[PDB]
Design a protein around this ligand. Structure first.
Ligand code: A1AVP
Ligand code: K
Ligand code: K
Ligand code: ZN
Length: 614
């Protein structure tokens, strides 16, 4: 499966508000046009498979709505403006139009076309630019600019026509999609996550069940997660902390078979409804962080978003990530604000009785295989020295250290670094080396010599490496099997059956927050002398979210499986699911909490509880 589907039609922009109603004046047809033209101006729309729109059938509509409400809406095309206004007064924050029933059927049908495209392996993922939005509509009521619930349609449709048992819905719109929650509150097969402006119930829709204490009812208890922002102005740090410490661990433990996104961009800076301070680029990462789920099968559906400029920018960021283009570096990240930390600690505590991870106590890639080893590399890869490179190698040899093979590996390292950093030609790479010491020294020092302010080293093995963590230029993440006794603040040391769950927990809760706050210019991966076979691909894919994806992996020893997985993850292929994760060993959880308490003073992004005032 390859490619991304873009589903859009100008007909969904042919309905508008016909009377004066300041509540709805923001929901304009231009939202679609500005969006699509955005993807057109940046050349993104041309790279997507343009799947056409269809109407949703009556049975498909009845999957999520009542026949009475369907018959009521079905009659709006026959009403004049006075009758339409009277009909709109019967619901909250909603207007109807002569074409709105048609357009809502088109929006639902576009969502279903996207679901069919993704599940039939015709495309890897995709986005649907639809209108009206859906996540506020309920079984027998239009609500909040929404007529029919597109995402609930998608989930129920996937369940019915593909026998899916686990679906994840991520609603990053700034409003609480109460329609989806109502639809799946007793359903443990569809996990609904939603962050939303709440302000202690004073923000629309002013529902007590939008609060963190609504975990779902009945058999679906623990499969409805609400994260209420109780203050405006939430930044990139708040969003990323919500992902790292709430959504992503639950998601990877859940192991969904399909991910559907209520992509509402009224949660971005500039929007008059959300009033948050998140830059559009954050949506490149919110997308990217979810790609390893469901083997990449992601369905992005448009919801809110009303600042035309920031809306176009955020849509472009999302599509950029869906196509696999390098995610942009996010700087200035730090601790979440106190209100966000309160919301996060509350939702974690209440959900801990369902997810034990929350309990507390009081050419894209290049490949340098061993000489003579001919490999079958994917279409986004290529193989490998010059006079300048050989001169630099001779210089470092006569200055700091006669194998000829190690010299070849060093020249290849210098060449791939030059191609990654001093050019847009190559993004990331992988080299099989012999001597780990000399290879790592050359790699790190030459990366620092190139315009690389900071470097994030990720070493899997034991013993000490030749890398100094004194100055604020290098951060080391060591995955070992021996004692830690960590002392430096620029290092994260980590020490067989429960190893997969523990490693994923450590990656989502400790590695990614520190690494995102660090904002490196180059990630340098090392693997000594094979439990890593279970997790290494996920780590590579998730760590590519930094340094614009520029990652140089050094592998000490040939392993066809490990090399294949490394290059596949680096080149952007789909990651295979880990299977439903379980519980890590309690000693490992205690060790992770100790590392967090050790590092969270310097690295605020590690916090998931409001700090204690001395
Ligand atoms: N009268 C204030 C609340 C009215 C309202 C309702 C919904 C939205 C959305 O953005 C839907 S995604 C916006 C405004
Ligand atoms: K939401
Ligand atoms: K649910
Ligand atoms: Zn909204």
């Amino acid at each position: 499966a390859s490619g991304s589907a873009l589903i859009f039609d100008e007909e969904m922009s042919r309905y508008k508000l016909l009377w004066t109603d300041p509540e709805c004046e923001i929901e304009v047809p231009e939202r679609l046009t500005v969006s699509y033209e955005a993807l057109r101006t940046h050349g993104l729309a041309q790279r997507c498979k343009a799947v056409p729109v269809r109407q949703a059938t009556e049975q498909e509509i009845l999957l999520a709505h009542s026949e009475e409400y369907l018959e009521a809406v079905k009659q709006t095309p026959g009403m004049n403006v006075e009758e339409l206004m009277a009909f709109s007064k019967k619901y909250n924050a909603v207007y109807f139009h002569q074409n709105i029933y048609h357009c809502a059927k088109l929006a639902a049908g576009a969502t279903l076309q996207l679901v069919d495209s993704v599940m039939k392996r015709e495309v890897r993922n995709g986005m649907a630019l639809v209108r009206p939005p859906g996540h506020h509509s309920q079984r027998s009521a239009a609500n909040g600019f929404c007529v029919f619930n597109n995402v609930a349609f998608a989930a129920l449709y996937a369940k019915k026509n593909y026998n899916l048992n686990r679906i994840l819905i991520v609603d990053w719109d700034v409003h609480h999609g109460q329609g989806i929650q109502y639809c799946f509150e007793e359903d443990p097969s569809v996990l609904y996550f939603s962050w939303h402006r709440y302000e202690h119930q004073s923000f629309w829709p002013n529902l007590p069940e939008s609060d963190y204490s609504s975990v779902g009812k009945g058999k679906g208890s623990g499969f409805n997660i609400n994260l209420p922002w109780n203050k405006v102005g939430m930044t990139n740090s708040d969003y990323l902390a919500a992902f790292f410490h709430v959504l992503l661990p639950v998601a990877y433990e859940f192991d969904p078979e399909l991910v559907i996104v209520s992509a509402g961009f009224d949660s971005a800076i500039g929007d008059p409804e959300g009033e948050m301070c998140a830059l559009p680029e954050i949506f490149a990462h919110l997308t990217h962080l979810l790609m390893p789920l469901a083997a990449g099968k992601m369905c992005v559906v448009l919801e809110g978003g009303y600042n035309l400029t920031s809306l176009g920018q955020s849509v472009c960021q999302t599509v950029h990530s869906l196509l696999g283009d390098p995610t942009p570096r996010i700087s200035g990240l730090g601790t979440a604000c106190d209100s966000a930390l309160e919301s996060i600690q509350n939702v974690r505590n209440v959900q801990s009785s369902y997810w034990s991870s929350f309990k507390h106590l009081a050419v894209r890639t290049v490949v340098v295989p061993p000489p003579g080893v001919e490999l079958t590399l994917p279409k986004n890869c290529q193989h490998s020295i010059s006079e300048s490179t050989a001169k630099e190698v001779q210089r470092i040899r006569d200055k700091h250290f006669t194998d000829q093979n190690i010299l070849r590996s060093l020249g290849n390292i210098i060449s791939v670094l030059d191609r990654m950093m001093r050019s847009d030609e190559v993004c990331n790479g992988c080299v099989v080396v012999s001597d780990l010491s000399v290879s790592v020294q050359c790699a790190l020092q030459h990366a620092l010599t190139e315009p690389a302010e900071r470097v994030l080293v990720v070493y899997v093995g034991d013993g000490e490496l030749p890398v100094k963590t004194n100055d604020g230029k290098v951060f080391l993440v060591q995955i070992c099997t021996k004692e830690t006794e960590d002392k430096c603040v620029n290092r994260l040391t980590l020490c067989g059956e429960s190893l997969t769950a523990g490693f994923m927990q450590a990656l989502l809760g400790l590695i990614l927050p520190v690494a995102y706050e660090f904002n490196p210019a180059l990630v340098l991966g090392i693997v000594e002398e094979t439990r890593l076979m279970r997790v290494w691909g996920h780590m590579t894919c998730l760590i590519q979210g930094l340094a614009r994806g520029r990652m140089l992996t050094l592998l000490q020893g040939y392993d066809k499986d490990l090399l294949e997985l490394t290059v596949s993850a680096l080149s952007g292929a789909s990651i295979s699911p880990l299977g439903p994760l379980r519980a890590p060993k309690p000693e490992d959880v205690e060790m992770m909490e100790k590392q967090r308490q050790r590092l969270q003073e310097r690295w605020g992004l590690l916090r998931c509880t409001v700090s204690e005032s001395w």
